[PDB]
């Protein structure tokens, strides 16, 4: 993921 | 080369409705969400949504709910957003964005008669 | 809803001077897993917000070194140890802890003179 939010972790 | 190219400005009438585009490159297309985000005319970010586009599961926020539908096309790479029964409100500039790390240029719209 | 409070609303700085702006938290923003989803993002008027900062600390990619976050609780900090050209525009805070994940109203670093 991006790491910015649990759902783009 | 990541690239979120994002459709044309469009004109809208008040209570009329819009559909845009988020065309996607340079990565693969179902390992990111794809968020979107308002700016209105001289004002910060607000949070829409973001869909998945492996199973086209989205998540609202609960002010943009009844207004948004979020879709994709994995095929393509490619996320839509339609926004619904707008008003002079809803004027702004809407962003997508690949896990919020790089964003689209944005796609103004203007709800006016 | 979270609500993220920035100060100042315009910090007039000076190439070559260090700047530091805060961002305050309605409620502590540490989710179940133990990670902190506090962003920041740059936008220069007329372009699209960057990816600047993400859980509290971590840099964004390509972002350079001269910029560093900070904080815990309620409190979160950004801070440029020498202000250039370049970091002209606005800065938002943001969480992804809870949803409708939200954004600060926005602080503009504009240049002294």
């Known amino acids: 993921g991006t790491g910015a939010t649990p759902a783009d972790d | 080369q990541v690239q979120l190219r994002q459709s044309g400005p469009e004109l809208v009438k008040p209570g009329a409705s819009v559909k845009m585009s988020c065309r996607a490159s340079?990565?693969?297309?179902?390992?990111?969400?794809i968020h979107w985000v308002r700016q209105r005319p001289g004002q910060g970010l607000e949070w829409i949504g973001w869909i998945y586009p492996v199973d086209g599961t989205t998540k609202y926020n609960e002010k943009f709910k009844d207004k948004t539908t979020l879709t994709s096309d994995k095929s393509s790479s490619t996320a839509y957003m339609s926004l619904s029964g707008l008003t002079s409100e809803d004027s702004a500039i809407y962003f997508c964005?690949?896990?919020?790390?790089?964003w689209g240029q944005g796609t103004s719209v203007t709800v006016s008669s | 809803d979270v609500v993220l409070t920035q100060t100042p609303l315009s910090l007039s700085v000076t190439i070559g001077q260090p700047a530091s702006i805060s961002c305050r938290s309605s409620q502590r923003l540490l989710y179940s897993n133990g990670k902190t989803y506090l962003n920041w993002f740059q936008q220069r008027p007329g372009q699209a917000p960057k990816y600047l900062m993400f859980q509290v600390s971590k840099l964004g990619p390509g972002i350079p070194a001269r910029f560093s976050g900070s904080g815990s609780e309620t409190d979160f900090t950004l801070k440029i140890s020498r202000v250039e050209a370049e970091d002209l525009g606005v800065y938002y805070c943001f969480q992804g802890t809870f949803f409708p994940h939200t954004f600060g109203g926005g602080t503009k670093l504009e240049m002294k003179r």
């Open positions: 964005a690949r896990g919020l790390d790089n």
């Open positions: 340079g990565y693969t297309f179902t390992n990111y969400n």
